[PDB]
Scaffold this active site. Structure first.
Site, PDB file in Angstrom:
ATOM      1  N   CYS A   1      -3.716-103.699  11.641  1.00  0.00           N
ATOM      2  CA  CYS A   1      -4.230-103.193  10.367  1.00  0.00           C
ATOM      3  C   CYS A   1      -4.932-101.834  10.455  1.00  0.00           C
ATOM      4  CB  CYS A   1      -5.181-104.209   9.731  1.00  0.00           C
ATOM      5  SG  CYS A   1      -4.389-105.778   9.323  1.00  0.00           S
ATOM      6  N   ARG A   2      -6.227-101.854  10.759  1.00  0.00           N
ATOM      7  CA  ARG A   2      -7.015-100.625  10.841  1.00  0.00           C
ATOM      8  C   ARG A   2      -6.583 -99.590  11.883  1.00  0.00           C
ATOM      9  NH1 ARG A   2     -12.794-103.273  11.467  1.00  0.00           N
ATOM     10  NH2 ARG A   2     -11.343-104.708  12.515  1.00  0.00           N
ATOM     11  N   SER A   3      -6.418 -99.989  13.144  1.00  0.00           N
ATOM     12  CA  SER A   3      -6.042 -99.003  14.160  1.00  0.00           C
ATOM     13  C   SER A   3      -4.655 -98.395  13.954  1.00  0.00           C
ATOM     14  CB  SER A   3      -6.197 -99.573  15.586  1.00  0.00           C
ATOM     15  OG  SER A   3      -5.304-100.637  15.848  1.00  0.00           O
TER      16      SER A   3
ATOM     17  N   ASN B   1      -4.806-104.789  16.264  1.00  0.00           N
ATOM     18  CA  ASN B   1      -3.883-103.652  16.316  1.00  0.00           C
ATOM     19  C   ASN B   1      -2.736-103.765  15.310  1.00  0.00           C
ATOM     20  OD1 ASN B   1      -1.630-102.021  18.631  1.00  0.00           O
ATOM     21  ND2 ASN B   1      -3.216-101.084  17.342  1.00  0.00           N
TER      22      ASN B   1
ATOM     23  N   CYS C   1      -8.802-101.487  17.353  1.00  0.00           N
ATOM     24  CA  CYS C   1      -9.393-102.517  16.506  1.00  0.00           C
ATOM     25  C   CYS C   1      -9.117-103.825  17.246  1.00  0.00           C
ATOM     26  CB  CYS C   1      -8.819-102.512  15.069  1.00  0.00           C
ATOM     27  SG  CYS C   1      -7.076-102.923  14.795  1.00  0.00           S
TER      28      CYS C   1
ATOM     29  N   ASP D   1     -13.033-104.607   8.047  1.00  0.00           N
ATOM     30  CA  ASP D   1     -11.751-105.273   8.283  1.00  0.00           C
ATOM     31  C   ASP D   1     -11.151-105.724   6.951  1.00  0.00           C
ATOM     32  OD1 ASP D   1      -9.598-106.785   9.135  1.00  0.00           O
ATOM     33  OD2 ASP D   1     -10.742-107.953  10.593  1.00  0.00           O
TER      34      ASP D   1
END
Ligand SMILES: [Mg+2]
Length: 150
Positions: free
Chosen positions: A15-17, A13, A10, A122
């Site tokens: 939150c999402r990933s 690096n 993401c 996001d």
């Protein structure tokens, strides 16, 4: 053949990933596939290098038993060479990876391609519930990834 390497990507690096990595690690354990896969996550940017994941991300992972020690880092040319699957969250991530490392032509794609396409929104500007929504969207995509690759 060596274990398959998966890298979630993401922008920051945090939150999402990293949540995608925690979920993947949890699934590998439940399915007994830790000897066949390797996983990590990285960001296209360097703003958060060295930092732990976002508190909201850590909270949601803890709620689901998918937390792990994460350290945010920025994607490198070595990563593109070493990893077999480079799974990005959205189209901006995808375009950014390809801009710096065109060499990743065949192995980079949207994580939601496992479910036929889409972008993982996001949640950084949202709240805990947005982080929970991201968690389940990722959970669904990864269960499908393992059904097909596991
Ligand atoms: Mg890592």
């Amino acid at each position: 053949d060596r274990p398959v390497r998966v890298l979630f990507v993401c922008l920051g690096n945090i939150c999402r990933s990293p949540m995608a990595e925690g979920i993947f690690r949890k699934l590998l354990k439940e399915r007994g596939l830790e000897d066949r896969f390797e996983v990590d996550s990285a960001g296209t940017g360097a703003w958060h290098v060295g930092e732990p994941m976002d508190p909201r991300a850590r909270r949601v992972l803890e709620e689901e038993g998918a937390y792990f020690p994460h350290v945010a880092r920025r994607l490198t040319r070595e990563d593109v060479l070493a990893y077999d699957h480079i799974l990005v969250m959205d189209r901006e991530n995808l375009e950014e990876v390809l801009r710096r490392f065109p060499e990743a032509r065949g192995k980079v794609r949207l994580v939601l391609e496992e479910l036929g396409g889409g972008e993982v929104q996001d949640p950084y500007y949202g709240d805990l519930e947005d982080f929970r929504e991201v968690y389940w969207t990722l959970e669904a995509a990864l269960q499908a990834f393992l059904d097909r690759h596991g």
